[PDB]
């Protein structure tokens, strides 16, 4: 998995087209979102997160939360981005793990938000330019490194 | 190397403070800076892009440009982008690579910018979410 996290002052979407057969279903009123003073965690599930998702979400959970609070984010924004790397996950697997790192970001006490999977979408975002504003994280099973 | 490739409406930076102890000289008017209609080009210089520059820089160039040429756009910008990777290249590496970039893109016929290096920076930027509008790029030169 490849994490890209940017603390924004705000990040907005806009859903354009499907980008897989069956996308995640959503309602008309999800195809436009906006979340503001943000984490954004723009999120690639790569194949060798397939041998352990729970792992994996469990480790994306920890350093995403860890950076949330360095940098006294209150807000998190899980985007689906696959393109941040090459060699990706199967669609249903990257699904469920960004659910599992959704519910995890919640139970940690944050206020959560998303943008739906599977599909094309056109952003906005402002990075406050800070320290620690722009950082990545490379986060994959232990037995695969 | 690592390159986010973002096809976006606008690019806007706003430089904040140095983030190195020897960054790139720059003047009051470099501080700030906007392009439109144009493939951002957010880039990490790897360690291992130390082991032969021209290599990897030539690459790049080549890569950017077909994406370029994909997407449909004529203006591209160069985007020192340090954090895309954790295994960094060293500094002047860092710049001499950028700039090549920078300067092969121009060599091509595009209109290109590029934000300086060395600086906490600001950005605003609007992709455009079409296909191939955000790509990613992993160049690693093994001679
Ligand atoms: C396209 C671009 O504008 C948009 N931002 C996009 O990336 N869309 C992705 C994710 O929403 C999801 N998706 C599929 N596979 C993955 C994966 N391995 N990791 C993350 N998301 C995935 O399905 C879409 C196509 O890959
Ligand atoms: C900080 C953040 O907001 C800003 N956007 C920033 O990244 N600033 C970087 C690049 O301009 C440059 N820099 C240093 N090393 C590298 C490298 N290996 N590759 C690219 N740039 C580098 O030096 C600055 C501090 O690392």
Redesign the interface.
Known sequence: MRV?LIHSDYIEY?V?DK?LKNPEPISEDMKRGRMEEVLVAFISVEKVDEKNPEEVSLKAIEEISKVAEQVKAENVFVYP?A????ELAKPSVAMDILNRVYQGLKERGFNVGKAPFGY????????????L????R?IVPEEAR
Do not use: M, V
Request: proline share 4%; net charge positive; with cysteine.
């Open positions: 890209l806009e354009k980008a981005f393109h941040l790397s090459s094309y979408k056109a952003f906005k975002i402002s990075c406050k330019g800070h320290p504003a722009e950082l990545s490379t």
